[PDB]
Ligand binder design. Structure first.
Ligand code: NXG
Ligand code: ZN
Length: 197
């Protein structure tokens, strides 16, 4: 079973947004619009914006899940490697096996799907802070793309779904992720490769 990755704005005009963080060697998280790909360091804060055209109902939630991008792997559950799942870096809420965490939200819930065994983290959808136009969720990715016995150099996608209180689909967006030591350099490289290709 592979979760859908079809972009779907839905009734509320749901879509993601990303900051413009640049590609300096020191940058810890940076998004490439050309590649639709986020590059980030291990366990560092990744701001992801939520934008809507109209207010979803109270009880709406926002779920994040990782899948493998490549066809021959998409069927395999994305999880932390055998080292990182045992390094006791728990925040008290996230299971140690989960790749994706939400940082600094006490209402975050972590799901191990009883049928697909896939992991996800879900939070309530909330309106922007006074003065802002969108809401920001802070994600952490808790393994490197290169982790042996884990992602093992396989590219992943994060799928973000807007859900009603029952879990029914209201909206969907997605982006590729590379968790790496030097996001700035890697983004610059992959953008250059694309331009040549
Ligand atoms: C520019 C003026 N229009 C856009 C055309 C509105 C701006 C105000 N927002 C309110 C709003 C509510 C929720 C929520 C919730 C749970 O009930 C989540 C988000 I992100 C959010 O932006 C709605 C859109
Ligand atoms: Zn790992």
């Amino acid at each position: 079973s592979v979760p859908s990755q079809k972009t779907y704005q839905g009734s509320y005009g749901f879509r993601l947004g990303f900051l413009h963080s640049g590609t300096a060697k020191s940058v810890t998280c940076t998004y490439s619009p050309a590649l639709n790909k986020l590059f980030c360091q291990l366990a560092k804060t990744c701001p992801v914006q939520l934008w809507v055209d109209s207010t979803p109902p109270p009880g709406t939630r926002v779920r994040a899940m990782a899948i493998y991008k490549q066809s021959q792997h998409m069927t395999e559950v994305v999880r932390r490697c055998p080292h990182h799942e045992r390094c006791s870096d728990s925040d008290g809420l996230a299971p140690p096996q989960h790749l994706i965490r939400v940082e600094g939200n006490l209402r975050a819930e972590y799901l191990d799907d009883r049928n697909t065994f896939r992991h996800s983290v879900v939070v309530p959808c909330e309106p922007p802070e006074v003065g802002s136009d969108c809401t920001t969720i802070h994600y952490n990715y808790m393994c490197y793309s290169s982790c042996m016995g884990g992602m093992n150099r396989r590219p992943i996608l994060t799928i973000i779904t807007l859900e009603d209180s029952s879990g029914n689909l209201l909206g969907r967006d997605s982006f590729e992720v590379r968790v790496c030591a030097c996001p700035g350099r890697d983004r610059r490289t992959e953008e250059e490769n694309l331009r040549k290709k």
